[PDB]
Amino acid sequence: LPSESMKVVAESMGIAQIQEETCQLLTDEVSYRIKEIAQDALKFMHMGKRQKLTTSDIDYALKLKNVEPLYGFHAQEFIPFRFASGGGRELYFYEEKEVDLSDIINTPLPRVPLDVCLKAHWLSIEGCQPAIPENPPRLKPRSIHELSVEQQLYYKEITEACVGSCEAKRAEALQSIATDPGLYQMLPRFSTFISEGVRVNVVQNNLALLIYLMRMVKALMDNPTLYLEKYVHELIPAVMTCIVSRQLCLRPDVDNHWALRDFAARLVAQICKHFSTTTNNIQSRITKTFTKSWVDEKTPWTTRYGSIAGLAELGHDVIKTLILPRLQQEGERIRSVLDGPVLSNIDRIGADHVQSLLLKHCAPVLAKLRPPPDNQDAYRAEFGSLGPLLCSQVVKARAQAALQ
């Protein structure tokens, strides 16, 4: 330890005018005792088999050398505090050095973790290590497929369960996709089954077939073991298709599921923005396609509503920078659907869904950057779309913030 720290300690105690040889005599004695204890605390680390050197190892190394693991206070009578430790002092270098005494009371206590339990598994089966989640893992000859017949049968069962004939079968198959560690080396056949399926499943707009495939995509994504961005060039189109396409079936009713399907597509777009991100390839490409879907002349309500949802779920700044200069066009589209003398189409339903979604996004976009003053008629400067109801949504958001 440095001697210029030992003179600071001595003169802050009442012992002034100490020589350098007196001060060097202090810093080789105490640096030995630190070296004697840290060599002795490494015995408890090697015997408690954690290679960590926790804070409690020095408490037992001090007690072994007949010194109290008393830290920050020393009792000359020993009777109040013996060789039992107090766990040290939770102090920092970058600390505040003054707190309010009711700040420590009002904070929530941390959760006591789970107690120790004994689970058994298999390190080895007759020499081979299994790939369970508890473990780390002239005629040319007739070739064999790279899948086993147990793996091929597993693929057939999982795909025939994921087309959703029974709901419990689906849900297990989805959890099986979500956590099978050996689901790599089968992933080309799953990606091809998804991609090919959506494209021949939008020829006739079969909503369940599509809702099951989108749930299969979501179950493929949250699996941590498999490497997905080799296959995302097939995934992106199918998930985005579940958003920008027209509905060949009865569009007006299941449009509720249709709107839900569009929301799922928006979530898939958000996942695409979140993971797999490199410079200017994925997020900006789907953002450009969404914007030219929006600026598209006479955009379909189905395609228009889906693209609106897709651009809506892109995060905080994206609606802060993109939905701003377009409110007048949205209002004009709503006015045209309204002036219709004919509802024998899906245009009116598409318009109502688009307006509701745009108004909710505009509400926090406003709650987020500005005070809640003049919430009655100032929104009439923005064509008066949501107005006081938008103000009420902002107030509900403020109440949720107060609850938080």
Binding site: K140, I144, H145, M240, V244, S245, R246, R285
Partner: protein, 91 residues
Amino acid sequence: RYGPARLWYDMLGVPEDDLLADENFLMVTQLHWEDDIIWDGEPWYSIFPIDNEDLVYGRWEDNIIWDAQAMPRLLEPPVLTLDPNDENLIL
């Protein structure tokens, strides 16, 4: 010498007998797949045929001839192998 490509052999007269990172090249980052999205459209045996093991696995890239004079690997005549995995071939 007498097999397929005998014509070539006779004509010759031979008589014995960071932008290189892997991601840049993944086709999600190199393909306009947005065009694919269909807007306004109007087990006893494997159900997937056994793929060509040579195409799927072999390094056929080693038969490309980048420089005729300075060619790194000495190439050899290839014998006809008549793969029987392919259907449409009687044997």
